Design an enzyme around this catalytic site. Structure first.
Site, short mmCIF file in Angstrom:
data_model
loop_
_atom_site.label_atom_id
_atom_site.label_comp_id
_atom_site.label_asym_id
_atom_site.label_seq_id
_atom_site.Cartn_x
_atom_site.Cartn_y
_atom_site.Cartn_z
N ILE A 36 1.30 7.18 0.93
CA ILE A 36 0.54 6.24 1.73
C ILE A 36 -0.90 6.24 1.24
CG2 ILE A 36 -0.11 5.52 4.04
CD1 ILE A 36 2.23 7.54 4.93
N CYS A 37 -1.41 5.06 0.89
CA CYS A 37 -2.79 4.91 0.43
C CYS A 37 -3.65 4.55 1.64
CB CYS A 37 -2.89 3.85 -0.66
SG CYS A 37 -4.57 3.50 -1.19
N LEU A 38 -4.27 5.56 2.25
CA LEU A 38 -5.07 5.34 3.44
C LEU A 38 -6.34 6.17 3.36
CD1 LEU A 38 -5.50 3.96 6.03
CD2 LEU A 38 -4.00 5.59 7.18
N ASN B 270 0.80 -1.21 0.00
CA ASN B 270 0.00 0.00 0.00
C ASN B 270 0.84 1.27 0.00
OD1 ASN B 270 -1.30 -2.29 1.79
ND2 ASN B 270 -3.00 -1.20 0.82
N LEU C 26 -0.10 0.04 -3.74
CA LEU C 26 0.56 1.03 -4.57
C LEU C 26 1.62 0.44 -5.48
CD1 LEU C 26 0.82 4.26 -2.41
CD2 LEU C 26 -1.00 3.35 -3.87
#
Ligand SMILES: [Zn+2]
Ligand SMILES: [Zn+2]
Lengths: 147, 83, 98, 94, 72, 109, 83, 61, 109, 94, 83, 97
Positions: free
Chosen positions: A84-86, A77, A119
């Site tokens: 950061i994919c959050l 991710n 990601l």
DNA sequence: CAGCTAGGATATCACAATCCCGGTGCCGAGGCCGCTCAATTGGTCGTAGACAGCTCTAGCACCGCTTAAACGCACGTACGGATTCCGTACGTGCGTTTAAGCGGTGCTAGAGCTGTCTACGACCAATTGAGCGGCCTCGGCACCGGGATTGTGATATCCTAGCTGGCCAA
DNA sequence: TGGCCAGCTAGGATATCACAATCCCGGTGCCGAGGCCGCTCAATTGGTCGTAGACAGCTCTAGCACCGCTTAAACGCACGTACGGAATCCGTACGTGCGTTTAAGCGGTGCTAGAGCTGTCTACGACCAATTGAGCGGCCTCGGCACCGGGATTGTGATATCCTAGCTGG
């Protein structure tokens, strides 16, 4: 004006410092901050210490901050650029949460990567296909850069 | 910049009487005039709101006849004689 | 001797008069002032074509005549000849405007 | 074996977002589908007419803003435009 | 038919109502008991007014020719 | 390697299918070409309208002490809100009933 | 009720902007925030309640037409004990 | 020199590659360096023959 | 040098422009492709309707002893015919006036 | 110098075929143009929806017959269909 | 292939009375039971004559729900719950 | 014995039928009426049960709305009893005749 | 002139209808499952329209003069509404009469999906004549002043009824 | 002294005449309908080329038909009340007309905003080929809710207690 909220959040963080993570401004600019986190226990990243960057947009707390990794890491991710994919940074943003919760969520994603929306496709493939290989490679890269 | 108000009295009592006479009305009560003022104001507010929207969608400061025609047509009261 | 017509007798003749002519019954200058005053509340310093103002008047007068026909029918239905504001309300409510 | 499409999945997701613990009958779902189709057709038809009136050949968000302003009344239209512009802004930001 | 005065007195005597007879009751009685012409309703209205002014009839309800009447 | 597939709806944070809306628009003979932001705007508007209806419908259902929305609840939600009532004034809802109201003249007194 | 009749500064401050409550608006979820923070966060992010995710769109549209948004009682109480 | 991005002006002399320009853009605004691209990494400004006051354009994210 | 140009309206013996109607159809975003007979049928229908309205309006004008048709005559022609009145019940005509009628209750007696 | 189109010439030709010795005001001609455009739009809109409903992609005279039947009332519709069919037959003859 | 005309009497006096009861009617005069069933057949003729021509254009033999829905829609009486 | 004075049963029926959503016309005679009406436009037509239900729903809603308008007309005429004059007036005002 | 009787309103009592609550089975809401078709991504090409520059239409302002229309006030007719009042057209509540509703099996028109292929319409350039604006002019009609027909209102005359007075009879 | 008849007066209805309004008439002058022209742009012409849909062939869904019990709904009727409507009576609101006051309309002038049209160039969307997972139907099962029987609450209808004015009898 987001300055009052930023200063209040910093004051509370100083009042209640975290255990493994730490952050704050690294200069007179309250909008640009550096976050320092340690590898959570029982994780391949354990032992390494990661440094993060922060750029507060001029609408806080009503907009998510621009936060990414300044430490190279091996996570699905997370891209090679340290982004950061959050959800709390993209969709689950709410003006009623603290930065400590964000860091705890980041550590959780480090312990619990989500290959559904990664990601780097290769890291997600490794995490789904060989958990031991992911744990080895993340540890190796933590030792190589985060240590 | 030429702010004006209180134009609703421009619709005179004899004018309302003339409209009602064309409508086929013999005798008129005294309370008709104010309520007719209100009804006409409501109707004009509803039409001009759409006309102005049509104009400002095309990005010009002049309300044309076709804009009014479209505003009326979309309210179910098609009007002929203006293209 | 002062000659006077009975009440309503001139009303009928002017009904016949205005149901035959096609002129606009409202005064153009105050109607235009009213239209501009209403339009002030959406965009400032708007400009109007004279044909647009005429179209607005032509539509408004026809709408009011149509409303008056129905409000006269309601007053007749109530067995009286003087239209009252309750009749206009009933007509608008039945037509679904309110 | 012709596969037909509807909006039941999305309606259910929105229902779970609004009321986390409320169900919807099958017949009510069909009513919601009809409502969605009707509003879609209204807005798209209005936008097409705007584009034809202004001698354009493209339907953009500019036309849909005007169509929503014409169709929806008052505060509902205000909130709808607020919602639409925000979504377009987020979409272009990524 | 006898005088409208006598027909009204007879109507009030025939109809033993506690309040006396109404104009409508008198009108109904006269039309059913006597050969009266189309002008009966006007002649009854006029005769009641006269009999109230002469004091032959006492008004119990209403005002003028409208209401109920008893013999004085 | 090409990329991962992210839906345009997820890009816009929506629930309604932006791609499906785009396909319907460009297959519905509405214009020669369709802009990029038009489906994004339209899907957001539709989602807002559906959510607005559903909130009131759920409130009506819970006022009736039931957990499933039935068309009676939709009718009660629509005909109570003035804005939605005016938007859907010319719409009949099957199995919807009517809003209970009695003219005050007819009540005994 | 806010609480209270004497909202000490910690409560008299906004839950978001943390400044003194200016024209506070009471949500259907009984949350109290100032008019600036409310009028920002309404159309700012998601029309939801920042505290308990409560949807307020129907309540907001209900109160906007009647201008019943601002909590008059608490807004007057604050003026009596605070600037 | 001056450099335009299509907006924070101006930026580095014709001496820093795309990576350093993106890093400075991120520092000065907060927009991610890699997000989204540069339209006109390891390439430089002189490699593209980018003169002063040139108009630049700045997907994966 | 191929052949003498004959309009499709002349081929069908019509008056309205079949070519112009055909162009309007395909430039009107009504469908992807347009059949050959569609403009012919549409032009015939429009010509018939215009002929009907003009016949009635001319009758109304000669009943008013005039030679030039004015909007008053069109209004009188439309409102009298039941078919056209129902067809154009939602249409307002400028300078049209109303059909003269007085309710019998209002007449003196 | 925009070349704008109307139906004035054709309206005048029909008027001369109906009443050879009757004039028409300029404003009446505009009313006739508005009426012609309105009816044309009604019929075309109905035909387009019919073609979409029946999963077609070509508007033919078959759809226009049904559109006329739906729009025009009663005797007017019957006469219009009779008129249209004859014209199509003659056109297809040559 | 033998349906007579008596079916108009199928709409009974109690059925019309309960329809009016839902409509909010207190009491009903006796002449209404004919006027209402006169109105209803006029309404149904208008709707059905549009449904059947849709079916004819589709070259079908049965009348589907979508035909009725379209016929109602073109009369400004859109109906939800059947497609 | 017991006897409700006139009007009360009507009011309780109003409250009952304004709270329920059932179809108020008997399905079989309504179907027969529909088939009789349609039998002149085209012969030997067929119907989907869904189509018949849609027709009945629309017709019942139209009649309920017509009665709502005609009740207000009668009240405006200072009565409480509906009579065909009111239906005629409502139809005329709503542009149906 | 007084008491008793008839007509009235308020409070309390009884019965019925809409209600509600905890149990019980029954079917569709809602969830998972795995396939597939519609959405997505990555790439080419051309053209719609965003923008900049220029023209000249017509929207606006403003002023003085004529006069018709609007205003406001006087006055009284005829209209709306308040009141009584009478007849039956309504609702209510019985019991007897009926066909709607349901679950049942049986029978197939015709709806609806596929796969072939060709008649039809899109797309195009090159050809040209219908339709456009520009220009011009005179016959149709708006506008006015003189003389006419129809409808309504008011006044006067005639007829009918009522009341009073006188005369005759008991 | 009472009753009946005759005469006179008053009121109401009907008819005729007058007055005013719309109307019908040529005269007269202004200008827009309508025709002539010639240039141009949209429609016609003939050829390619691709795909929509007609036409055929098969699949099976849903529409439909007769059948027989079990109610609940329809129906027809008895009864009587509250509602509709007809009839009258009173006060004032709304029509009519007049004198005075106000500003619309006219037409004539002077100013520029901005409508609307041209040209340049590029960002954006159509379109195609390849790819992939979101969304579909099929299957399943179980809890939300319809149905019901057994007690509770509220509202409507009726009766009994206290209050006023009128009539007959003392
Ligand atoms: Zn705040
Ligand atoms: Zn909250």
């Amino acid at each position: 004006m987001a300055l009052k909220r930023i200063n209040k959040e910093l004051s509370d963080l100083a009042r209640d410092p975290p255990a493994q993570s730490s952050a704050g401004p690294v200069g007179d600019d309250m909008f640009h901050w550096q976050a320092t986190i340690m590898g959570p226990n029982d994780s391949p990243y354990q032992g390494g210490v990661f440094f993060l960057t922060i750029h507060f947009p001029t609408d806080y707390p009503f907009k998510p901050p621009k936060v990414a990794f300044t430490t190279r890491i091996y996570h699905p991710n997370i891209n090679s650029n340290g982004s950061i994919c959050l959800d709390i940074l993209r969709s689950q943003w709410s003006p009623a949460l603290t930065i400590s919760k964000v860091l705890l969520s980041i550590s959780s994603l480090l312990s619990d990567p989500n290959p559904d929306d990664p990601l780097v496709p290769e890291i997600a493939r490794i995490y789904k296909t060989d958990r031991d290989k992911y744990n080895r490679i993340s540890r190796e890269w933590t030792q190589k850069y985060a240590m | 910049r030429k702010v004006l108000r209180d134009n609703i009295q421009g619709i005179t009592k004899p004018a309302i009487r003339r409209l009602a006479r064309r409508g086929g009305v013999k005798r008129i009560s005294g309370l008709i005039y104010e309520e007719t003022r209100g009804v006409l104001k409501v109707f004009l507010e509803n039409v001009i709101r759409d006309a102005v929207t049509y104009t400002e969608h095309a990005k010009r400061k002049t309300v044309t006849a076709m804009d009014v025609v479209y505003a009326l047509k979309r309210q179910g009261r098609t009007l002929y004689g203006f293209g | 001797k002062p000659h006077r017509y009975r009440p309503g007798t001139v009303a009928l003749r002017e009904i016949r008069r205005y149901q035959k002519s096609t002129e606009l019954l409202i005064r153009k200058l105050p109607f235009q002032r009213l239209v501009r005053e209403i339009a002030q509340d959406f965009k400032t310093d708007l400009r109007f074509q004279s044909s647009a103002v005429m179209a607005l008047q032509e539509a408004s007068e026809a709408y009011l005549v149509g409303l008056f026909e129905d409000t006269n029918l309601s007053a007749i239905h109530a067995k009286r000849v003087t239209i009252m504001p309750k009749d206009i309300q009933l007509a608008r409510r039945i037509r679904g405007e309110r | 074996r012709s596969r037909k499409e509807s909006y039941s999945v999305y309606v259910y997701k929105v229902l779970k977002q609004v009321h986390p613990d409320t169900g919807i009958s099958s017949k009510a779902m069909g009513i919601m589908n009809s409502f969605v189709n009707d509003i879609f057709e209204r807005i798209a038809g209005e936008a097409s007419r705007l584009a034809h009136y202004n001698k354009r050949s493209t339907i953009t968000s500019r036309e849909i803003q005007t169509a929503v302003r014409l169709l929806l009344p008052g505060e509902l239209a205000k909130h709808a435009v607020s919602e639409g512009t925000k979504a377009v802004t987020k979409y272009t930001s990524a | 038919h006898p005088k409208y005065s006598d027909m009204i007195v007879a109507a009030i005597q025939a109809e033993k109502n506690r309040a006396g007879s109404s104009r409508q009751s008198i009108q109904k009685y006269i039309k059913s008991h006597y050969k009266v012409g189309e002008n009966a309703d006007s002649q009854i209205k006029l005769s009641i007014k006269r009999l109230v002014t002469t004091g032959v009839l006492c008004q119990t309800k209403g005002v003028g020719a409208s209401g109920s009447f008893r013999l004085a | 390697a090409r990329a991962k597939a992210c839906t345009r709806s997820s890009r816009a944070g929506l629930q309604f299918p932006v791609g499906r809306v785009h396909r319907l628009l460009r297959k519905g003979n509405y214009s020669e070409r369709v802009g990029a932001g038009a489906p994004v705007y339209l899907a957001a508007v539709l989602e807002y309208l559906t959510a607005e209806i559903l909130e009131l419908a759920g409130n009506a259902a819970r006022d009736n002490k039931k957990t499933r929305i039935i068309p009676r609840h939709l009718q009660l939600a629509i005909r109570n809100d003035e804005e939605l009532n005016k938007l859907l004034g010319r719409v009949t809802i099957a199995q919807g009933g009517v809003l209970p109201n009695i003219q005050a003249v007819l009540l005994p007194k | 009720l806010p609480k209270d009749a004497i909202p000490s500064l910690s409560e008299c401050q906004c839950g978001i902007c943390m400044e003194i409550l200016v024209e506070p608006v009471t949500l259907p979820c009984n949350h109290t925030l100032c008019k600036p923070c409310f009028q920002s966060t309404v159309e700012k992010a998601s029309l939801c309640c920042p505290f308990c995710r409560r949807r307020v769109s129907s309540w907001t549209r209900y109160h906007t037409r009647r201008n019943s948004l601002v909590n008059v009682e608490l807004w007057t109480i604050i003026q009596k004990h605070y600037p | 020199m001056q450099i335009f991005v299509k907006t924070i002006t101006l930026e580095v002399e014709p001496s820093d590659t795309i990576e350093n320009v993106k890093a400075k853009i991120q520092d000065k605004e907060g927009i991610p360096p890699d997000q989204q691209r540069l339209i006109f990494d390891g390439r430089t400004l002189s490699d593209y023959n980018i003169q002063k006051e040139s108009t630049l354009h700045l997907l994966r994210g």
